Amino acid sequence: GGSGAKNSETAAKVALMKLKMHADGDKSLPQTERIYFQVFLPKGSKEKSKPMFFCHRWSIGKAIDFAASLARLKNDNNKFTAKKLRLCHITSGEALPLDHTLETWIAKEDCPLYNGGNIILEYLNDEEQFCKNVESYLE
């Protein structure tokens, strides 16, 4: 295709539905309780971030520990004496608690993370609340 790329509302809807289909999972599935999330790779050359299928009824922190297994990636989170892979906002460092669930925040008044959003995974201690700047690493 070409002709640049116009900007409109429909473009977001089509792009969203098209992305969910690419996300690691089933397209035919109802995905009524499960939502797709864009995880930012640490050193993803070809791609900066990859979509992943997650459940709304899953701990925010645990979501990472699980995704690491399903994706078959290397990371020391099961232990305690070692940095654990966790999700946090880009250019913020603020890392939500693992006891909190996605549906909880999404359903809550705040609702910081919305459907089709983006998130990055970095090695951060459980006790650690605010991590360094991720942008610095991807600079």
Side-chain angles (χ1 to χ4, degrees):
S3 82
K6 65 180 188 72
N7 279 119
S8 275
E9 272 293 276
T10 299
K13 284 84 162 298
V14 181
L16 166 52
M17 60 178 298
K18 194 64 178 56
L19 223 59
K20 266 176 297 195
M21 287 157 102
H22 201 235
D24 290 51
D26 223 325
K27 54 232 272 81
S28 207
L29 258 52
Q31 65 162 353
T32 183
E33 48 168 310
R34 286 153 196 195
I35 191 60
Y36 87 116
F37 266 97
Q38 272 193 319
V39 184
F40 265 101
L41 289 177
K43 55 148 201 275
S45 171
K46 190 64 159 274
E47 208 75 274
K48 293 84 157 58
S49 58
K50 175 189 298 193
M52 285 191 193
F53 210 53
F54 292 108
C55 210
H56 75 128
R57 57 153 277 178
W58 211 295
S59 359
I60 300 151
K62 289 267 91 138
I64 296 88
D65 302 346
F66 203 80
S69 200
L70 180 70
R72 307 284 200 71
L73 273 157
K74 273 292 200 195
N75 69 330
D76 287 2
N77 80 74
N78 287 92
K79 301 280 175 87
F80 181 75
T81 328
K83 52 260 209 219
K84 315 92 159 172
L85 215 60
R86 210 72 68 161
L87 82 90
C88 51
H89 261 106
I90 301 94
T91 323
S92 302
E94 260 262 51
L96 277 296
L98 83 89
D99 206 4
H100 274 237
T101 344
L102 310 143
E103 67 92 45
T104 300
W105 273 107
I106 302 161
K108 270 164 170 174
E109 53 190 46
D110 301 73
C111 186
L113 275 169
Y114 231 71
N115 84 311
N118 324 315
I119 311 177
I120 186 143
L121 238 54
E122 199 163 83
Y123 283 105
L124 175 75
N125 303 267
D126 201 319
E127 281 177 319
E128 281 287 300
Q129 304 187 32
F130 314 86
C131 71
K132 271 66 63 55
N133 281 22
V134 296
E135 47 165 30
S136 299
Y137 180 64
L138 310 148
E139 194 206 277

